[PDB]
Amino acid sequence: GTTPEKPEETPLEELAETFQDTFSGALGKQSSSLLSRLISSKMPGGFT
């Protein structure tokens, strides 16, 4: 959803803790899109 001021210059350890403060644990739109593509493109026919 939101982002710190300069995310590109924040180390990924630190970016993780800022997101953690407002994060429900739910996968969100971008992760869910990439997992749908992984399964639909790399799993054998019928393996949903």
Partner: peptide, 7 residues
């Protein structure tokens, strides 16, 4: 077994 949301 115990559940944990993803970090």
């Amino acid at each position: 077994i115990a559940d944990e949301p993803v970090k």
